[model samples]
Target: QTQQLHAAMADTFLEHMCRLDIDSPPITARNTGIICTIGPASRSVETLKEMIKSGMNVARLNFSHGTHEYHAETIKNVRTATESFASDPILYRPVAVALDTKGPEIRTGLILKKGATLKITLDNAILWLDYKNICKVVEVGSKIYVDDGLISLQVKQKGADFLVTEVENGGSLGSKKGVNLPGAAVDLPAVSEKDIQDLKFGVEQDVDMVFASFIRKASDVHEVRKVLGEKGKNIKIISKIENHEGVRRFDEILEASDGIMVARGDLGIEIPAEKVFLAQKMMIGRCNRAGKPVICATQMLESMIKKPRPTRAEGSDVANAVLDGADCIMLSGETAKGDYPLEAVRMQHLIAREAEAAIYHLQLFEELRRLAPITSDPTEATAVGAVEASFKCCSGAIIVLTKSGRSAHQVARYRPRAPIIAVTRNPQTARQAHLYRGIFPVLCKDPVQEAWAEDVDLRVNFAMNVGKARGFFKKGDVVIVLTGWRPGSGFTNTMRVVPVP
Candidate 1:
């Protein structure tokens, strides 16, 4: 019976593909999601809604810059904006809220006042951390990179209060400029006290995800998870891989976290500039193989912060990140502080749309399928086969009935040509599916026992109703429906191709 069912499904998929017009403009949806940071420039509810309408899939609140009060307001505004725009036709999916934690990152204290001059002197040259009360240890002649390595310093001596350093390369010293101690093991916890407090606040706000910055090892990710506690189990943890240690411990870090972000800003400071691109490609590829969403972040359109137009290189950077198989691309200061926030998001949307259209889906499907573990988990193998079958036949959409959203993620990893309608009973899972590429999340109630007993037809009927309401399909369209036979099984072992009617 199973073999016959599989054969019939494959035939249906083939028929659907044959009917599709090859020359027609592909379905109007952007696969590569855009993450825009929320800050002074784009914090307003009006601006946030406009951003969502303009293609921003995630709103990232940077804890490094704002106070808890400030972030709370931003969080409220984001939730309001997302809810208000949920029914809007322009917003194809819900906008996910991501809270970015300020991990154990060291920075210079109030150095010289803005527009103030600093001369090399022993009495007034020390820097201190009031929060930690411990000065950075450095040997004589040790190099210190400050303000994202824009200003360089040489440590002459270490005092009880500060590191007396001479300016090797002086630039305008701003307050709280980031400090990078190369090859030095400065004592610091993976997640700082401030980060813990911020995390608790994030939990209170009920964020969809949290980006832990400057993850050095797997332990760092574990530390954040511990702090997140029971309230944050459903919240996704995205480890931001920056610095040399993180790059060296890439595989372990990827294994520890739910997802990863290639934070290029600080990563460039820690490693050679030439190697950043290679690292990004490697990380994206690894994340793809692991079936985890990888976000390529930072400075993709930095030039557009002040100017309306991005540099040619900036355009290519966004396009290449998509081609490299990054599930999402992030904008930092560009949308947060830029003069043209709406324009930046629109440009990213356009670039992603063009780049995604250029991708050869068949090649992508093959590459992703090869990475799937055939021996491990029979459910995964079945899911992979279902996605491949749907692709080969060009099914209208892949309908995933999920409770925890894992099946939908697995299907998304294959980057199928068809759209994914993720039907879930859990609202959180439904919202989280918005982050994945090509997934349209639909919320459905639990199936009736009598209906469920009859070949799980209730779930299929619910999915079809939601799919049609979302314009996913019409009568007679073929779709591959994946779900487990047992209710609350938390695994997908069933795949059936059904014609919409």
Candidate 2:
């Protein structure tokens, strides 16, 4: 009987929700997050609000193509849309904004036709590069890929100030196209002066995080943090691993940054395209073990940019990304300048939930816990126990009352079947909570007066009532309430089993 009960309790979310029992409830939303870039097609407040209603979790501002004024307007519009979305009883479901900074790049100076011989030199010529020391960085026979490897060249010989190259994979190169010297030793600065200006703009605009692009080493993460300074030091820095160097020295980069974005566009060009999946899986696995959020970006649904429906492979791509343990899956051009921006977001939402319901949460919990050593820290122990309780009772959700979002993040590491309802007073904390998987942030606007004890109850029950209305659980389902015993952050040691009335 005990074994049979365990077997029945270990059902997947879809199975649990689809049971013929009269009390079983259907699933309502996806636990995985969807981050979409805001661009010309998605800049208006009305369209942005519509996208948010379709389950866009994070809004990204791309500094690579837009001006400060344009980005500022987009930022203002994003806030307006968010405010409108959570205007009433939504408890300020804040959406996070990430500024993707334009990293230092080396683009070709002039166009070259297919199978054309090009000579690059340090001299002031049409084919000259912006980097002064390009001659020193390349070898006699190194390969250079241009325009995301659409045009490729190989150096035949080196001169005192030039390198003679022949186009191997011939295609017409654009005047300003990205160049990748995968086989050469690069010496580009981690953060360029332009990057400094853009990062400061993000700080001034009060963005929640910055996706530091072209991060080649751990020093890039440090340099980005240094540039942010004390005023914006609290801003989370997520490193975009887009080059061979970043992949080579990733363990250190993972340690230095707040999170990772497995950016595959340039990475696929810098290295062989066949190995991009290996890099993605490796980085995702490492970030999962380290308890840091990892994002999968670039071209998940390329066809969805024009068509309302995503291709079969595109749907599989999104599902596989969720199955691979990415905290968030991002849409780039599909949502940036796509014709069907809202449709893409809704499709991403649909794919994520289908994948989330397919995950075996029971084995995942035990395996994740088995990998890490049991620690004695109160918050860590409390998080573990809360997850265990949720699993044992088949709770519909874990309600975490957090001040700094640590308790919610801690519980998220365990990967329980239930979504973590993270209730916090800090709006930034609430927005940042989307970085982790299964975190549903709720902003408690109720004034915190001298009523300390009752405030806790109010927040918990507030989330409880909201969850019921949202159908996170039915009236009689159980939930684990994880909270702090004291008033500040880092003191989360309380847990309770609360049944919905």
Candidate 3:
């Protein structure tokens, strides 16, 4: 917006991420989606819209807590929020709704003094384990923490109607607490009766994604897959790698699910598990290559639950997640019940955008090209060219016209510096677009023309108009306009170079 910026660096190229003191670049938008857990604090239409305005790409319904009678209400809230904005030209576009399966779904146990021996009666006062069938006694000396926020006990032996334990570290425990059994091998159904009910509800609601928990292996994800069944077979499943088996077996599990979730919540109560940190690092960049979305989750600015500001370390945590190429950064209690819910989402938006700005896209792009496409298909071939040409021309965006959203998915796989401007008629396709990095999905509401050529103009023109309406384009800006060549054109073999009107 300044004319005297000729003092800006010239005679050579400044990298896409590089900037001069005086020369300006478009303020990079946050490409890494923020999945906000929707709870009592944000279930209303006003609060939902507020979070959406503050950069909530995915509204997550956590079924672990209060199996929602209101979850149905919250889903309607999500739709109302998105629908209210639909007539608007901007973010009204789409927001993905994610269904979080039952927690590493917690177990509850009360407390006793340190170094005390304890036995509790089953189905009586003070004894509640979520799954009692978990009585396949945890090995001797195994520890389970009460509230996980407090008092811990070591397993001694099992009984017919009671259990025995050595209280190693004890304190006054809250009545409802998260009993964490870190290394216990208790047999529990992966998709138990309750999970099936919750998942069936998730299917009924048509949630775009499932953040499946405690994935022991690829088989565990398959179990959730079976629950989703043919009805919700297309629901994107992101396995939560929160345990040693899931951590170590991610190579196979990554192949099983559509994406990955490094759920740090299950690791420890107060401090983030050191194990999931390493697992998080290992999977984030690794999945970027495989084109699988990875969400760096749990306590990203947890202190913000009670405060408006994030610790400096928390700030860097989010920025670095983006730098390392996490497709999504998830917020749990931070947004669901935090005092600074909107502030947390806003901070994430800014932090992620700045982090994405610092990413050196030039060399990164070359390395991504060297990596395999993961799928050998014609649409993706055109997507490769569209992205390659995007970098060459330094285009503003790669406009995509997709029915199933495959064209946009391929473009995002290559990780363009520019936005993937996706235009689609399918609402589900539009809603799920945020699962990928840099997809700015627009639901095209106009009726489809019978003629392929006219429809092409309809979509491509609307794609350009969308850019202009959104303040992303100028008259002379170059855009890579790509879609199908004919109505039957599933393969996006042709693309165009269009100037903004």
Candidate 4:
């Protein structure tokens, strides 16, 4: 019965499907990407959906503190929380969980009093020694910092319980605060014992990527890879350059990493405050040239964490990162545990849209296109050419035929202006192609039998017919179709222009 129905109504179904139009606009600059932090702000389905609507594409689960059970619950909620208006059907994008590893760090012990503050003034004493064995590690002349490097110290002498040092500035130190010893050069495993355990959990949970923190060298990446074993190759490794050593060794680390993240919070501690911006620019340029996705992390919307509006400086910071060509911009406290998480997301969207509008997307597109590898197939060549032409001429659509989905990737690499219709033979390829930007994959059956014959026009017509039926392209609408003269051939070997009739 199903077979007969399918066969009899296939044409009708195609026609009706093309006629069917959703109320949603085709060209929306507001990217619906949600970055849900596993915390109080994003714990509920309602909050998560709000975040998605506000433009969250990725949900990051920080592994710096939580347990396996907590993370599992967050993952479960993230995957299953999307539901229809009233019914049970859940809608969500391909969510990528970025596991932020807790690399080697130092924190002070908890103080006895509930609310206690230790005061430090200029020329006052301060010391930083090994937390576990404070006596053995620290000595006279050792440097120390308290509360995220807010208070600096130079050790005057080594004491039994603590090291005596002169405070460089006047500040209040609190319990369980972060400590950084810049010149110590402590010999410790880059990936700590806790980090290894968390990494194991990440593998078990099959996170999409790992944000390796405090990454000092390429060897650290290798160490993580070794620990990850077979699964390491599959999981994208985004090296979070959080220290001076990490910055110094960035080139080596970039060569070994799938992507890079500018961890500005910790990096500020490692490098001089004035130089952080320059460093950020250098890293962003390097990553852009390398064609690797780079994320600008930490405090992009710090004011959004507490207030609804972002500061002018914060807005400028985010805009700068976009102009610098960061693939992703990350918010930590603002989107995670912030009071105005939804507002934060909306503000981020506003800023991104403004930034996008200020610059010439065509220039950016051309720059990215120039970075892509040249293809020989006319279909691919046509697709690439047409996409570029569409951007230049203000055309509407660029259509492509890809059995293996290579054509779509090739087009996306150029960051085309028009919507990309990736015609594929496999449904799975269509779904997987969602990972690529500006690509709308259409699964269709091949009507022609010849595998090597050059027939760009025929293939374009077939794809156009399919596109029209599926409501992707309308009749009289100008569209550029790209395919090899020979269908199903390797590479985009040819190109063609077709108008819907």
Candidate models: Cα lDDT each: 0.76, 0.84, 0.77, 0.65
TM-score of candidate 3 relative to the true fold = 0.87
Give a tens-digit lDDT track for model 3, residues 1-501.
Answer: 321122122333453324423343435455788899987778889988888888888999888778566888889988998888887654455888898887445556454567988664457353566656545645666666677447777678866656678787767655556666665554665776677888889889889999887787777888998989999987989988766656667799999889998777765442235556666788887898888888888888999999889999899899888878888898989988888899999999988876665666666777888886456777878888999998787787889888887778888888887888888888888878888888888888888788778887887788787777776677888999886756653868887888877
Compute the lDDT of residue 469 as modeled in candidate 2.
74
| Residue-level lDDT for 14 in candidate 3 | 51
Model 2, span 1-501: residue lDDT tens? 211223345456566435324232226757887899999999999899888888888999888887888889999999999988565655456799999988888876754577778777776643667777777888877888877788788889887777889888866656777778885558888888888999888889988889999898877799999889997888999999997788889999999999999999878888898999999999998998989989999999999888889889999999899988899999999989999999999998887876666566666777788997877799989998899998788788899999877889999888876889999889889888999988999888888968778888888888887788787887878899987777988988999998887
Model 2 stretches with alpha carbons more than 4 Å out: 1-26, 110-116
Give the root-mean-square deviation of each candidate in angstroms: 6.6, 3.6, 4.2, 11.1
Q: Write the per-residue lDDT of candidate 1 for residues 1-501, one digit (tens) a residue.
A: 211122223334454334433243435556777889988999998888789778787889889877888988998998888778446422235677899887786665664333222333223333543334334445678776777888776766666554566676656667876778665544678889799999999889888889998888888899998999998888999999887778888999999999999999888887777899999999998888888889999999999899999999999999889878888889999999999999999999888766665555655676677666667775777678888888666687888878788888878888776778777667678667766676777665454466565536665676677667656567898989887867775568888888987
How displaced is residue 288 in candidate 4, in Å?
A: 0.9
Predicted candidate 4 versus true structure: per-residue lDDT over 113-205, tens digit per residue: 222333222221322223445446556776566788877766676655545456675666567687776645445677899999888887887
Clashing pairs in 2: none
Q: Report model 4's TM-score to 2 decimal places.
A: 0.72
TM-scores, each model vs. reference: 0.84, 0.93, 0.87, 0.72
Quote the positional error of residue 284 for candidate 4 in Å: 1.3
